[PDB]
Design a protein around this ligand. Structure first.
Ligand SMILES: Cc1cc2nc3c(=O)[nH]c(=O)nc-3n(C[C@H](O)[C@H](O)[C@H](O)COP(=O)(O)OP(=O)(O)OC[C@H]3O[C@@H](n4cnc5c(N)ncnc54)[C@H](O)[C@@H]3O)c2cc1C
Ligand SMILES: Cc1cc2nc3c(=O)[nH]c(=O)nc-3n(C[C@H](O)[C@H](O)[C@H](O)COP(=O)(O)OP(=O)(O)OC[C@H]3O[C@@H](n4cnc5c(N)ncnc54)[C@H](O)[C@@H]3O)c2cc1C
Ligand SMILES: COc1ccc2[nH]c(I)c(CCNC(C)=O)c2c1
Ligand SMILES: COc1ccc2[nH]c(I)c(CCNC(C)=O)c2c1
Ligand SMILES: [Zn+2]
Ligand SMILES: [Zn+2]
Lengths: 230, 230
């Protein structure tokens, strides 16, 4: 209600399963009266590489280029590439940011990692000091919606891949929390390519039905215990 | 044959700390008689986006695009883009692969994440099934050479970032071990920017002497327990 939602989407095919979890998310939040924005990275042809072209202006120190130092500088001078500035503008408005993506090597597809590297710069998403609980994006909610080729069986402490929670750490704690987001419980749709229709349709339902009360939720305790047990 | 090394370098500045760890690696390994090859992803302007342009010719179903599927086939009928081909040939010949990069959001810079997303495709680095111990790259050695913004204490069970082994999981286990690599303990250089000329030169020396006995080091027991403790 009145809330603004940002969905950063990372999938090349609209007909894909990720596409349906995304459309589902879009229809429901909208149907509820929420303002919804979507960043379909692939269709934007989003630049994922961190380069000096990200700072249009003149560098304070061109002798030894430090992307970290320069983008912090550029942000204060409003001289970051317009594509990054557009995204930061969306994040800044959002009350809720959803990441929709297929797991790639236990992480986010590279194009989305680029979005994280280029969009969450110092001065914008966090300050030193002013990170973790005093991150600059405090007051906002973040949620990861991950689809996997592997199965729930495969993703357990006594399974090959280890409990799926282990690979959420760099993203949930290292990124979102570091920036002040309150982290909601992740949506993990396991092995959709494998499951039958009466499963790929049950997962979606779960996503949809879950989105129906999303504003009802409380963040998770983004700790090592939560992620790795003991 | 014996001792071929591939270094995947992921930094934009040649005069950066990252640049030196890489130069000393190249020199020290070459001096011991090793065959060294470097992949400066930034100078190559490496493409990290997982798209249709990764396949030369006409898709095996452009109607509904699925990256995994499509590349496995392109790989089988030898039709992958020339850049993915070049890297794969480089990997195929190496006995040891080193990843030299600064830590970005507890992971690798998007550009290096793309390399993995696109170079380690089904059919080349692993198969379904055919992974971890039965991965197609079984028998090679991998090492992660990482630099951080955070200081040593920050990366402990009591620090705000938690033990560094936590973010190593996705890279070391979910990627390398999964492709069948044998993983040597990671080389981590803490906060080279905050350190002093004196201190940085000390970390560079460390990396160097280590490269001298790197061939006699035993791989780590890359297990869920190694990374997360008891
Ligand atoms: C580079 C790379 C690395 C990877 N690394 C990992 C990894 O580390 N771990 C892991 O577990 N997996 C990994 N994967 C696999 C990946 O996570 C899965 O392939 C992906 O999650 C599948 O989701 P999708 O959105 O592509 O679905 P799809 O491939 O589209 O499959 C879903 C099926 O359901 C159909 N469908 C679409 N919409 C609906 C709907 N509304 N209702 C029902 N069915 C629908 C589709 O047409 C399709 O046939 C990797 C893949 C790649 C390319
Ligand atoms: C998008 C982004 C996200 C990040 N996320 C994280 C994160 O999650 N966690 C984290 O801890 N950090 C993070 N960082 C920080 C980043 O990891 C560090 O900035 C990086 O590791 C520093 O390495 P460098 O090679 O850039 O060093 P440099 O900035 O190049 O510093 C080394 C300096 O030492 C000088 N020097 C002196 N002696 C030598 C010598 N012998 N040879 C060469 N150089 C020497 C160099 O010339 C140089 O000026 C992030 C930064 C960015 C940009
Ligand atoms: C369960 O752990 C992993 C780890 C790395 C992986 N890389 C790929 I590619 C897959 C799934 C393959 N399916 C498709 C459509 O490509 C995968 C699964
Ligand atoms: C510890 O987690 C992160 C996460 C994202 C980050 N982006 C930058 I630039 C830094 C370096 C900030 N300096 C110090 C001493 O932390 C950084 C550190
Ligand atoms: Zn946390
Ligand atoms: Zn392992």
């Amino acid at each position: 209600a009145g809330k603004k939602v940002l969905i950063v989407y990372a999938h090349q095919e609209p007909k894909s399963f990720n596409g349906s979890l995304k459309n589902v998310a879009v229809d429901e939040l909208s149907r509820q009266g929420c303002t919804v924005t979507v960043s379909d990275l692939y269709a934007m042809n989003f630049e994922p590489r961190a380069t000096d072209k990200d700072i249009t202006g003149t560098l304070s120190n061109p002798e030894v280029f430090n992307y970290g130092v320069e983008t912090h500088e550029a942000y204060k001078q409003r001289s970051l590439a317009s594509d990054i500035t557009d995204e930061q503008k969306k994040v800044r408005e959002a009350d809720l940011v959803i990441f929709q993506f297929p797991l790639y090597w236990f992480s986010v597809p590279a194009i989305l990692k680029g979005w994280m590297d280029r969009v969450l710069c110092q001065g914008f998403a966090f300050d030193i000091p002013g990170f973790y609980d005093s991150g600059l994006l405090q007051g906002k909610l973040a949620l990861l919606s991950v689809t996997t080729g592997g199965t729930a069986e495969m993703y357990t402490k006594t399974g090959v891949n280890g409990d799926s929670r282990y690979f959420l750490w760099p993203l949930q704690h290292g990124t979102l929390h570091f920036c002040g987001f309150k982290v909601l419980a992740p949506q993990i749709s396991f092995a959709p390519e494998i499951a039958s229709e009466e499963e790929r349709k049950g997962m979606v339902a779960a996503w949809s039905q879950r989105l129906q009360t999303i504003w009802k939720e409380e963040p998770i305790p983004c700790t090592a215990h939560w992620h790795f047990g003991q």
